[PDB]
Amino acid sequence: AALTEKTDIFESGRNGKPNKDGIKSYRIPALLKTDKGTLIAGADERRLHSSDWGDIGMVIRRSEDNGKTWGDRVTITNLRDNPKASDPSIGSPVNIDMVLVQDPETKRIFSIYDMFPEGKGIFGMSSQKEEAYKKIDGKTYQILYREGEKGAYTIRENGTVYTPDGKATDYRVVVDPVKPAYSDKGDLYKGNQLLGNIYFTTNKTSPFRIAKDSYLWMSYSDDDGKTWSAPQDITPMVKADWMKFLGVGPGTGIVLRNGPHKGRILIPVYTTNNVSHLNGSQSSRIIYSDDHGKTWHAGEAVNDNRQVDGQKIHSSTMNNRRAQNTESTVVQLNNGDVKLFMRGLTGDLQVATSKDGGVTWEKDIKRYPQVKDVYVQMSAIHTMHEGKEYIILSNAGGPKRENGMVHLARVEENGELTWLKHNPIQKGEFAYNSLQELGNGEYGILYEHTEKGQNAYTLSFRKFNWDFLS
Ligand SMILES: [Cl-]
Ligand SMILES: [Cl-]
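Above: inputs. Below: predicted complex with chloride ion.
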């Protein structure tokens, strides 16, 4: 066989029950082959149910034998639940959806993922804007709102809470968490007494909360994924004042390997606006770093100044369901161009092109009727075989989220894509997935599937070779 049997990396419970570890659900795979040869498999650990909210931790497992066996779960981040929440299913600050990538110069490994305070995830965002940050004297601070008060408190040096007028208080935020899984992050103290947590939004025991908005956090590892930094809040570097949601397109990001922007880290993200939010404004873009992950910047949206049937749209003002593009996967070609394969609503594969290292996008989105898109996440990777350039892309074959496929395209000298093969890899339920090159003509994939009553989803791994592809 040219495809290995299914190995289950993150096992969900069955028939609506928790698994042996008390966890009902895993979702949202990310797969990363590191410079040491290690495979890191990431996921949402969704304890209480399968929905995009609740008690969710960012977790990884490591394989040191190319996916044959796997080590213990390592929790990158898991924010503590609000013990007073009326409904535990929506009673925790939330992390959800990660992107993994390694810097090939520094060997640092990044996991970038979404964060929401307590509530129904994205559906817990305030209906009206709540400002999340304020710049005071050239310094950007996260805002806190106090019960019964209108003004903006700020979290400054060492987590000290300042009044809206600019005076220090005896309140302090845990900004340098030290507990396992960093479960103490956001804890709110008055002197030495723990009062609550700034991410709690109901039945609060402390006076302070952050804006009910959408955030982006990053954790990094310098030891091949064994241990992880405390979360860094990168939101203010990349989130514009008009953006409602800003979140990752989960999977595995890339580092540009050629051209004037060689070394740039690219992370797929997408946004919504306040005009049409999730109904008509989901828009793909990337964020990037040119300094090995220290600072981040937003590129333009594919939808910015995009002409749709003779009239331009902009990601900040659009209201057009079919012009949306959401979670995406990013690839650089040998000619230096960046290709962004975007989940969307045309039924087929949508691809944007950037000639400037991901910052701006060409006028036209290219569609490939040869590859179905049933409106679900996908992953794609660059690969060379026998001196020829290809892209491998995996997603559901359909008609529903089912029949996982690995699609093989030749990259032409145009550089257009020619779809050569469409190979089934998993019968039955199939959703989010993440591909990696393993070396020696082999490839790995971590993907969502269920069978035999499993809760959505169990994340499984398979390896295949060139023979399987071609
Ligand atoms: Cl609280
Ligand atoms: Cl239009």
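Residues 354 and 361 are 5 Å apart (CA to CA).
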